[PDB]
Structures are given as C-alpha cells and as structure tokens.
Structure 1
Amino acid sequence: AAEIRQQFAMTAGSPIIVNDKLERYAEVRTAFTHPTSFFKPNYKGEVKPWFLSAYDEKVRQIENGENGPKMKAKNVGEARAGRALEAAGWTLDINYGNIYPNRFFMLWSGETMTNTQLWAPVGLDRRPPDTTDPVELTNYVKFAARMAGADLVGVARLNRNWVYSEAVTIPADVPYEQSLHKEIEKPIVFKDVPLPIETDDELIIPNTCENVIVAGIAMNREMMQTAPNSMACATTAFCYSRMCMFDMWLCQFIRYMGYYAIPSCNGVGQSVAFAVEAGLGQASRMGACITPEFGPNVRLTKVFTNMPLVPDKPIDFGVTEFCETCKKCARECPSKAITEGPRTFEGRSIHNQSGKLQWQNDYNKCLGYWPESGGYCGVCVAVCPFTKNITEVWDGKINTYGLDADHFRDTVSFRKDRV
C-alpha cells in the first residue's frame, strides 16, 4: 500500500476548490445540534431530542427481538447483545463525539491531567524541545501515532477555513449531569499568545499553531455491512473511544516533547477537509473521505500543534471521477439524503458550508432516518465499492480492535513512508 500512495501523490497544494464566498462555519449548524433539526418524533408520535427518540426505537426493537428496522433477530437475547455492545463502545466518549473543546477528555493543556501530575518530577512538559528538525519530529510523531491506535496518519498545514467559527461547548463549572441542557456557543479565534488558552469569552488558538495531524481509525468491515442495524452501531461506537484515546496519547507525547497540542475528536473543525489536505484520501459523493486502504469505512480524528512537521502530499487515485458515474450510495440511501447531481459551491441547506466545491447533501434527511431505524445508519459506507446476517457476525471472524489480519499488512510502516 506504500507503493500505491506514492504512485498517486499530487503536487503540494490544497485540493479543495473554494470561491470568495466561503466563510468559516459555526458548529451549531450541524444537524446534530441545530434547533431546526434537533427534535424528531419517536414511533409513538412524541417529539423529543432526536437521540432520545432513537433510544425509544432501540428499546422497542429489543422488546420485539429485532436487530434493526424490520430486521428480526435470532431471539431477544441477540437483540439485547447488539445494543449492549453498541452502548459499551461509547465508554470513553462524552455526549456523542467529544465535541466540547477543553472539557472532560479534550483538555487543551496537560497541566491538570493525572498522568502529567504523576510525571511532574521529570519535567518533560516544562523542558524546552530538544528536537526542532521537522523531518525527525515527523518520524517520531507518526511512530507515536501508530502506537496510539491510528491505522492511518497524515500531516497538513492548518487551513483555518475548516476550523469552526464558533464551537458548541458548556460553561466550565457545569457538571456532566447538566451538560446536555446547558450547551452554548463560543468563538474560536487565533491570536498572538504563547499557548492555547480559554477565557470566559473565547477559545484562543495561538497563531503559532501551524499544523494538524490527522488520524484514520479503521472500522470493522463485517459489522458495518450490517448497516443500518445494531452491529454497525457497535463498530462506530468503539472507534469513537479509540479516537479519544488517540487524542490524549498523542497530545501527551507532543507536550512531553516540548510543544503544545490541541485534541479534538468530532469538535474544533471539519475532519473530512483536514483528512483530504493531509493526504489520507479524497472527498466523495456521500461526503466522506475515501481512503485507499479502507474506503470510507474509517473514522477520523485530529490534533493541532506548533510542533515543526513536514506536510504530506494530497493524493489522487481517481475517486472524483469514479463518484461522478457511480451514485450507488445515493440510490441505496434510505432517506434520499445524497444527491445524484453534480458538484456545486452552493449548500443545499444551513447544514452545508457554502463556498467549496463538493457534492451537496441534505443532512437533515439523513439524521431523520436515525430515530426511525434506531441506529447511526451507515448504509452509504456499507455499499460503497471502495469499502469492499448479524448472527453470522457474532459467530464469525474477529480479531483485536476488530482489525482484520487479511489486510493489516497494508498499514505496516517504516521510516521511508513516514517522512
């Protein structure tokens, strides 16, 4: 796979085409959070926050021995098991995505972490960097990223166009039990300051924050192929906890090297754009970043840092041209969310960021199918050619973290492919 990636390397330069209308995008506009999309009826006709309506459908399916919408399970025991696996997968994730910056697991400084306090006598986080060479730092930090659970890792210069204009967060002293009821907006700004810092009014990223490190965290193929049923929910969930552990591990390594690091998971900015600029893959009709190793069946997280690094080259292995004629995801999508038309610079609704050339999809239509089906769908990922019953999954092949030994050698790494 290291041969393929260098064969398809582009010359330097962001491959996302923009016009002069593009503005940074307020995170509150996503379908998950925006008031126009947030409330959906359950199967009884009661309007609730969308994820609560989806909970009601999970309960109804368990009671009726189903693994998904009109998908009978082997028995009620099997239906329960898939939802127990899904729920457990989310253990290391706050409120579905860890999006609040500088809260809970997503701290912008390591100073208060238990690990940092235990290691304080060594002083790694206070000691100036011993390495400033971007070539050596790129090799060190990619090695560390693989130790930290990334299946893919890439580096790009930080394009501020993809950083949210304002983040969704909670006040710093609000306890977890009131968090969902007290979400607020807060601007993300760049200023001449030494370190990332949060004031009462602003999330402040330093102007020295030059780079973003993007990780790809592979999902399980057999489980995602059960979309829109529960086992596709389970591989999604487990990878969100893998994302959180990756951010914390890598931020701690970068801090202990003498630099600062900002974790993010699903917060701070748009992962698909960063992933394309870092060379992990190409944008697609469904909207995801499609990778040569995994297609779109991979989750993304990212870390921002002033650590000197060598940016990776973007890659072109023909996704744009394949998506022009394929349209399989658009035809299988249960909610008709994915367009069959051509790419434009004009968003279809508030949930899209206008000003960038992309396939414009209706993401309120997508979210609307989640309470109906009681899961996170994923049909588009499952049917995509680049990605290539539930009892057979539970009785079938599995390996550590759901990785597959039949393909795991595609992500082996030596120095030559790290820098």
Structure 2
Amino acid sequence: KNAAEIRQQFAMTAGSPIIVNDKLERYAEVRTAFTHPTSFFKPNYKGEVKPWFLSAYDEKVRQIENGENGPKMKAKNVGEARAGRALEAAGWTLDINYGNIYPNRFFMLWSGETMTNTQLWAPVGLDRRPPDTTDPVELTNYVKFAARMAGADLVGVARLNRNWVYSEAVTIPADVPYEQSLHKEIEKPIVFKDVPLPIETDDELIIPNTCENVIVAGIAMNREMMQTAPNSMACATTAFCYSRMCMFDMWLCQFIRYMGYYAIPSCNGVGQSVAFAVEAGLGQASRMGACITPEFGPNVRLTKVFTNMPLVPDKPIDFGVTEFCETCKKCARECPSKAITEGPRTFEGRSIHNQSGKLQWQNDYNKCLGYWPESGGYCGVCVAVCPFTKGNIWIHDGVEWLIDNTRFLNITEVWDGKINTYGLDADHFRDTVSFRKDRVK
C-alpha cells in the first residue's frame, strides 16, 4: 500500500472543488449548534433544561455511578467507567471551553509577542528579522516539515477562500478572566483590511489583505477508541486530539513568525475547517459532512493556520467519495438522532446551523447535538461506522488503486489491547511518511 501513489492518482486540476451559488454569504459562528440559543439548551436525564454540556456532565456522572461506559452500556465495573471519563477529561488539558474558538485569546494569540517562548528568544530577533526565504517552493517544504514535527499526520496548503471565514467570531472581551468566560461570550466581526499585521481592535478582528494562504493539518484519532462510539473511549480520543491541535497551531505559528511572516492560529475558531481541508486536498466532503481522507477516512481532526508566507497550493483530490456517499448511507441509517440526511445534496440549508449557497448534504445539527447530553459524550457513531474509517479499504488491481466495494455492503478489550504513542497505529503509520517530493512539486 502506497499512500503517495494513491494521492497522485486521484489529484485534480487546480480550483476550489466546492460548488456555490449566489445565496452564499459568510456564516456567523454563533449560528453553530454549540453556540446558537435555539440549540444551546438541552434537557438532562431528569428533564432539567441546561447548557448542553452541563446536561451531558450530568449523564457522565450518572453513568459512572451506575458502572456504565455509555448509554445502556454496562462497564466491567465502576472503576472502568471512572477511568474512561478521567481519560476523556484529561485529554482536554490544552483546550479552552471545547475548541479554542475565541480568536486572539489564551492559546490562540494572533501575535507571538507576549508568549513566554517569544520573550525568551527575543535576543535572537527571529520574529523581527525580515524573511531570508521568499521562494514559495522552499517555504512549502520548510513549513510542511515543521508541520509534521508539530504533530500533523496530514498537511496541505490552499489559497484562503474567505467564503469559509466566519463573518463574526464568538469571543470574549479582552478584560474578562477565564472563570467568567462562559458567561461573557460576545460576537465580533472578522474583517479584511489593508494593514501590515493581524490586529484586534475594540470593534473588529482584522486579518490583513495580504493573508493569502491557509495551512490545514489532519490530526489522526485512534481507530479502536473511536469504534467504541458513542461510549466514553471515543470521547477520549476526540479530547486528546483537541490538545494535539492546540500544540500544532502554536508550534507552527511560532515557526512561521520566526521565519519572518505572520500567522493566525484557529483550532475550531475563525473558519470552517472542512471546507479548507477540501480545498487544501486533504480529502473530500461526505454525506455526514466531515472531510474524508484516504488515510484515515473521517477519523481525523482538523486545525488550520492562516499566513502571508508565500506557499504553493496543493491540488484538490477526488477519489470517488461523493459517488460512494451517494449509494452508501450507512452513517445516516446508524445515526442515533437521524440527523444525517438520506437525500440528495442541495444548496439550501436545513436550518440556521447550515451555511446555504454551497452544494452539500444538508444535515440537522440540532438533532446531532441533542444526542450528546442523552449519551453523555460526543457520539461519533457516523465516523465509527463509515467504511472509509476502516484501515483496509484500498486495493491495487495491477494497474491502479481502487476502493474495495465489499466494505460498503468492548471497552475492557480496548484498555487491555493495542496502543502506541499518541494512539497512532504502527500498522498504518507508514502511510504518512513524507519526503520532499510529497511536500512540494
């Protein structure tokens, strides 16, 4: 199996693959089901209406008390139930309020000047010296090498399509301390202006018009843990990867800054990761709505960094995902909340949570979020059942690579079973080896 061959075989010609029409407008981040008032509140198992994550907390507590790893899923004993939630909670250690979405706060600073690392290194002046390399070809090789050092299992580059940048971000005022953050969230416009550096004013988050490129990283989750969806160990691989995302953004932004350019981190903030990932060639959009990659299927998290560093955009990829999703529908049939549509793609949003004006399968994400308090986790059944999440999809017929159509026709054992560093799998880790030829052409 040769992942590089596969990507070469299915590479497209240049151009954003996402089909759009005239009703497309940039999307206010507050509209996501996590944040919007119509979906933010959910009942707990006692019928009390709370912020959804607090209702989910109540269900986690109830499951531990009852020795369960998930809804109606008995654990080996209470200690096993306890251990799954402890692993999940610890995974979030380097993530603020589930996703690091507030731009230019906490870990997501838009300038490195106040960071302890920048201060320590200031006598070398790497962040003030003009770039010594401006060649996009060399820069792309350098920045992708750095990206792999920084924990990315996949990395791609695209020109920044502003359609996918949130019109307004969810954030907090700069004078609000952490313990009040969840009570003091606000909206703030993201605007593009003729300014030298990313800068935040009292009224606006300002991205320079020179911010040409976006670097997208894929952060692979653990197959065995995700297959326990919707139970606790799927929550744990999700959580650990959010902290890997945060480390990646900070590492990479600092490299870019020390190369003489600016860099904006984001994790789950700033813009829509799936669209950037598609335009950067990591994978294709899917019925469930995730980016499906050849290496990991949808079982991979995304983050991204925006920069004026000259780079060579990668080519999009088309390995037949749209055509398999047309006939598969497994995620839609298994979804415990019936959130995923079984119908065709449209340009018309299903509800406020969807951005209209782009051709996609339109899913009801309030229904999805509604299952999270009920199950006490982050579900993931769609990711777990997707055939592309299986590690064994690719076959070679003597001429070229193809997808095996036959693929589309417990937690104690996970704790006692195979694991490796960062939950990566040595049986497949060769798929993400990288030489210069697969970083830049």
1:392 CA displacement: 0.1
Q: Is it true that 1:417 corresponds to 2:419 in the alignment?
A: no
Alpha-carbon distance in 1 for matches of 2:273, 2:42? 26
1:132 CA displacement: 0.1
1:172 CA displacement: 0.3
Alpha-carbon distance in 1 for matches of 2:264, 2:229? 33
1:95 CA displacement: 0.0
- Counterpart of 1:390 in structure 2 is 411
Provide structure 1 residue ranges, at least 5 long, that are not aligned to the other structure: none
- Counterpart of 1:400 in structure 2 is 421
Alpha-carbon distance in 2 for matches of 1:333, 1:205? 38
1:352 CA displacement: 0.1
Q: How many residues align?
A: 419
Alpha-carbon distance in 2 for matches of 1:336, 1:21? 27
CA deviations on 1:263-301 (whole Å, 9 max, x unpaired) are 000000000000000000000000000000000000000
CA deviations on 1:87-129 (whole Å, 9 max, x unpaired) are 0000000000000000000000000000000000000000000
Alpha-carbon distance in 1 for matches of 2:292, 2:19? 18
CA deviations on 1:47-91 (whole Å, 9 max, x unpaired) are 110000000000000000000000000000000000000000000
CA deviations on 1:293-332 (whole Å, 9 max, x unpaired) are 0000000000000000000000000000000000000000
SS at match of 1:216: strand
1:355 CA displacement: 0.1
1:157-196 to 2 correspondence within 5 Å? 157-196=159-198
Alpha-carbon distance in 2 for matches of 1:167, 1:336? 29
Alpha-carbon distance in 2 for matches of 1:173, 1:115? 23
Alpha-carbon distance in 1 for matches of 2:46, 2:350? 30
Alpha-carbon distance in 1 for matches of 2:384, 2:436? 33
1:145 CA displacement: 0.1
SS at match of 2:39: coil
TM-score scaled by structure 2? 0.95
1:84-163 to 2 correspondence within 5 Å? 84-163=86-165
Alpha-carbon distance in 2 for matches of 1:121, 1:297? 42
Alpha-carbon distance in 2 for matches of 1:349, 1:177? 32
1:375 CA displacement: 0.1
CA deviations on 1:117-149 (whole Å, 9 max, x unpaired) are 000000000000000000000000000000000
1:44 CA displacement: 0.7
1:345 CA displacement: 0.1
1:35 CA displacement: 0.2
Alpha-carbon distance in 1 for matches of 2:281, 2:412? 37
Q: Give the fraction of aligned pairs with identical amino acids, expressed as a percent.
A: 100
Computed over aligned residues only, the root mean square deviation of the Cα atoms, in angstroms, reads 0.2
Alpha-carbon distance in 1 for matches of 2:110, 2:89? 27
1:7 CA displacement: 0.6
4+ residue runs of structure 1 moved beyond 3 angstroms?
none
CA deviations on 1:325-363 (whole Å, 9 max, x unpaired) are 000000000000000000000000000000000000000
